[PDB]
Amino acid sequence: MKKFSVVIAGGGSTFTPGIVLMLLANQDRFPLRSLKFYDNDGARQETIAEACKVILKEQAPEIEFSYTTDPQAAFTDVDFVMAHIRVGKYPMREQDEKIPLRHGVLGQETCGPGGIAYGMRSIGGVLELVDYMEKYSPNAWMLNYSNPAAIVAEATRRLRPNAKILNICDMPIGIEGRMAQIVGLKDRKQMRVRYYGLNHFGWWTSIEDLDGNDLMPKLREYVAKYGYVPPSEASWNDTFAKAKDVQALDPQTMPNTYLKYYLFPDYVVAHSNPERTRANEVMDHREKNVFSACRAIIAAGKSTAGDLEIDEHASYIVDLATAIAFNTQERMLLIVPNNGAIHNFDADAMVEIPCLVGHNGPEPLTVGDIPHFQKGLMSQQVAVEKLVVDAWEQRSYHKLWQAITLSKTVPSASVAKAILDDLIAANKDYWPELH
Ligand SMILES: NC(=O)c1ccc[n+]([C@@H]2O[C@H](COP(=O)([O-])OP(=O)(O)OC[C@H]3O[C@@H](n4cnc5c(N)ncnc54)[C@H](O)[C@@H]3O)[C@@H](O)[C@H]2O)c1
Ligand SMILES: [Mn+2]
Numbered sequence: 001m002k003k004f005s006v007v008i009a010g011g012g013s014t015f016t017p018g019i020v021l022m023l024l025a026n027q028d029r030f031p032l033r034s035l036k037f038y039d040n041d042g043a044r045q046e047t048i049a050e051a052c053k054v055i056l057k058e059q060a061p062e063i064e065f066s067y068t069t070d071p072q073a074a075f076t077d078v079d080f081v082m083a084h085i086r087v088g089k090y091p092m093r094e095q096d097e098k099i100p101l102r103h104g105v106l107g108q109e110t111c112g113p114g115g116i117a118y119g120m121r122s123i124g125g126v127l128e129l130v131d132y133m134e135k136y137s138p139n140a141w142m143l144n145y146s147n148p149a150a151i152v153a154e155a156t157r158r159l160r161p162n163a164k165i166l167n168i169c170d171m172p173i174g175i176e177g178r179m180a181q182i183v184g185l186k187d188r189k190q191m192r193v194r195y196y197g198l199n200h201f202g203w204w205t206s207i208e209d210l211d212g213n214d215l216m217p218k219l220r221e222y223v224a225k226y227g228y229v230p231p232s233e234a235s236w237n238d239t240f241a242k243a244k245d246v247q248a249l250d251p252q253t254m255p256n257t258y259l260k261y262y263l264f265p266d267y268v269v270a271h272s273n274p275e276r277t278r279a280n281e282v283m284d285h286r287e288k289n290v291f292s293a294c295r296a297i298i299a300a301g302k303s304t305a306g307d308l309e310i311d312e313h314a315s316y317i318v319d320l321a322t323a324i325a326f327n328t329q330e331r332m333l334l335i336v337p338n339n340g341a342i343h344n345f346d347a348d349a350m351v352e353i354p355c356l357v358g359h360n361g362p363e364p365l366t367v368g369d370i371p372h373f374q375k376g377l378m379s380q381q382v383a384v385e386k387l388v389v390d391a392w393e394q395r396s397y398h399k400l401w402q403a404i405t406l407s408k409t410v411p412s413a414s415v416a417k418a419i420l421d422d423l424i425a426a427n428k429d430y431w432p433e434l435h
Pocket of ligand 1: 009010011012013014015016019038039040041044045084085086087088089090109125126145146147148170314
């Protein structure tokens with residue numbers, strides 16, 4: 001078995017330790033000779049890196065390890081780039097969430113004007129990583145599990161069409177995990193599914209066990225009463241529960257949880273608090289906890305000084321990496337150019353659909369024609385995403401106003417323009433200039 005060189009772009013991330021623990025738990029299927037951290041925030045990364053340094057010397061001292069702010073040192077001699085950056089960090093996520101809310105619109109990490117703003121910040125950053133990877137490790141694959149993938153994937157499709165980038169999302173993985181528990185299967189890998197949509201905007205059409213038995217009837221009966229809350233944090237519980245109402249709009253399918261923001265934006269605004277948003281919760285909890293536990297590890301010189309555990313969820317990252325590395329043909333939902341897969345939908349749209357993954361990347365499976373309801377929703381939203389990338393590319397104020405105006409989350413062109421002017425003011429150091 002061969003060994004792999006990985007570089008984590010976003011070393012300063014609070015998820016880095018959990019992901020590293022995950023990788024160490026998967027040395028049997030994905031052996032590593034080298035692990036590197038890269039970040040543009042040195043001081044923030046140093047705390048994470050020095051703590052991970054202790055963990056690595058305990059569990060796997062044969063893995064060569066280093067951290068840096070230098071692209072050349074980071075991207076040289078790697079097989080994979082795991083990109084989980086958050087341009088602007090939590091202070092900007094806080095703005096994304098509160099600015100729309102002062103105008104009576106939902107503020108969310110990847111949906112609505114908040115997500116649009118995060119997408120406008122993220123495009124530039126990701127194009128940089130892609131360029132670094134191609135310059136120092138031309139044969140490397142980038143596993144981009146950063147958000148907001150619908151906007152960033154549309155940018156890379158347009159500007160780096162041939163780059164070896166794999167766009168993947170964990171939301172479907174988490175939902176499938178809950179589905180598996182609801183029907184009573186061991187795990188999600190005991191299911192074979194069909195699905196279509198945009199990232200954070202899709203539907204399961206077929207859900208079966210490996211033998212082909214239909215699991216849909218049981219899921220319908222259950223989700224119709226409790227949503228994706230299986231028989232086994234407050235904000236997420238509500239999202240998973242609200243899927244009850246979202247699934248009700250099309251009883252034949254199962255929906256992606258992000259559809260609640262588009263079908264019930266009123267509900268979201270009503271149950272929000274413009275003083276304390278999700279960013280505030282993470283900042284005062286997960287952010288402070290991980291950095292604290294990391295300084296505790298460095299100061300004590302022992303991992304047990306911290307309470308960092310394996311990030312089980314993140315496992316799907318290794319599934320993707322092994323699929324590429326060992327040409328496994330594993331079936332998974334990836335974000336790829338449509339080009340006929342959804343026959344009655346724009347060829348140049350980025351869609352989240354089943355693909356077989358091998359050494360050449362994905363081989364997407366056809367989907368067929370989709371119904372008017374989903375087609376209408378996706379046509380509206382994909383127009384939003386394409387106008388955002390248009391605004392970015394052409395440095396156009398007017399394209400971004402169009403984009404925000406088109407969103408199902410935005411009540412009118414006048415409110416859209418007010419939100420836009422506030423987002424511009426708040427993102428002065430991250431967005432290109434708009435004329
Ligand atoms: N398993 C996971 O890591 C996971 C889970 C859910 C969502 N996400 C998504 O991944 C992204 C990262 O979120 P997170 O919570 O893991 O990270 P985080 O918010 O805990 O930290 C982000 C890190 O990325 C760094 N960064 C920002 N811009 C950069 C650039 N241009 N170059 C290099 N580094 C940069 C920041 O300095 C910071 O250290 C988000 O979009 C999030 O929605 C990741
Ligand atoms: Mn996602």
